[PDB]
């Protein structure tokens, strides 16, 4: 059983905890409690093999961000399709990860969360795909923790990106 260390990053409010708790515990956290630092563990089957996932749910701001990057194997970059500022903050995070790993071959995925709030949408799906294209054909997904849409795929794809 191989162990995978995944880190969920993004600005506050985007749903980093909601996506993680939904995937690990099957519960939708309706409340809002700003996270200090949460670590979850979960055993999954990716490509017909048992994996052990240690998922690190991080804070929106504050700070030890460099420790997460040096130790993390895969990174989920999450924004809310509801807030434009959370989308713009992700470029600085992508460059910070490449700087610390000292490479561009880094398991990564761009996640646009809260796609169940299609009405209050500010960031478009094409603009998110355009960003992932710019990021060396990075993986891209629109997800919803409330509706359980594309939740399991976020962490399954990071596992395949580490196996390569």
């Amino acid at each position: 059983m191989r162990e995978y260390k995944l880190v969920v990053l993004g600005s506050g409010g985007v749903g980093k905890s909601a996506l993680t708790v939904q995937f690990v515990q099957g519960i939708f956290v309706e409340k809002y409690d700003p996270t200090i630092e949460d670590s979850y563990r979960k055993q999954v089957e990716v490509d017909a093999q048992q994996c052990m996932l240690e998922i690190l749910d991080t804070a929106g701001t504050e700070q030890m961000r460099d420790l997460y990057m040096k130790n993390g194997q895969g990174f989920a970059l999450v924004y809310s399709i509801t807030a434009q500022s959370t989308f713009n903050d992700l470029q600085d995070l992508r460059e910070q990860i490449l700087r610390v790993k000292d490479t561009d071959d880094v398991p990564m995925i761009l996640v646009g969360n809260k796609c169940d709030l299609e009405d209050e949408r500010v960031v478009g799906k094409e603009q998110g795909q355009n960003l992932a294209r710019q990021w060396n054909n990075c993986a891209f997904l629109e997800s919803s923790a409330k509706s359980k849409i594309n939740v399991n795929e976020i962490f399954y794809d990071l596992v395949r990106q580490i196996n390569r």
């Binding site: 515990q25 409690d33 200090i36 949460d38 504050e62």
Partner: protein, 310 residues
Amino acid sequence: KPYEKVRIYRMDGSYRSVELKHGNNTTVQQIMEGMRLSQETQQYFTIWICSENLSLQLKPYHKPLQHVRDWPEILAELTNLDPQRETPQLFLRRDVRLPLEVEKQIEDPLAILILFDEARYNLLKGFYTAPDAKLITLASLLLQIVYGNYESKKHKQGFLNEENLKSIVPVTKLKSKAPHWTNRILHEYKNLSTSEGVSKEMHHLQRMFLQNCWEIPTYGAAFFTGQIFTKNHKVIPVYVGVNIKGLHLLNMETKALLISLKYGCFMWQLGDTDTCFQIHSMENKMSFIVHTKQAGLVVKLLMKLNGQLM
């Protein structure tokens, strides 16, 4: 960051960092409020402080970081260990005083999940002594909970080896009794998946796992270490399990159930120098004495849990 924090672990290796508004003077109750728990979930759990060989449930008024600071002195009072190889951590665990009738009415999915992880941990460790039939049923539920539905193309042959087995059977049985249970485990696993009369929702399956654990005599037990002398005299290391049902004795080496006594079918007496306590099992004309520096806590817990019963 302009604040202090501490990690609160669970049995599955996960943790949650909470802010420390009053530094080392923060209480269990203030930390309990710092978690993502409602008053519904909070009534079933509390903060424990545990090292490798000592686990202590704390109270709302306790300051856990001063217990961390004072750990080497606490280990010297209660154990015969060297304090160097023992660093404690804080855990969120089931309240040992939680009555079984209250646990049986729990519906919160998070509370069920937290109770499920503790029970699974105690099962794989070998602390839950149950017949071979009850253990096979629990192993098949774990297969459904962890590996999903049964599929003949995947689980029929060459799947329940020992690395996969280690996660569904007690470690005390993995070598002796388990490798001959594989056919019986898959049949119940196969029956669980292909049966619409059983809810495959996650909190429902975990609730089922706990139902089979509630009949186990050592369920929810707080465990202490001690010594008994054979009735020429040989020392036998023992675990002393005290729960809402009664008192139980495990062979420390093999976790075999020596004796289990429901409340009202035995009496206890604390030793003179505190270093021991005596158990007179009525309706059996038989007694025994357990030597342990934790004998004071064992008797104190026995009184409170017995006094809880109506």
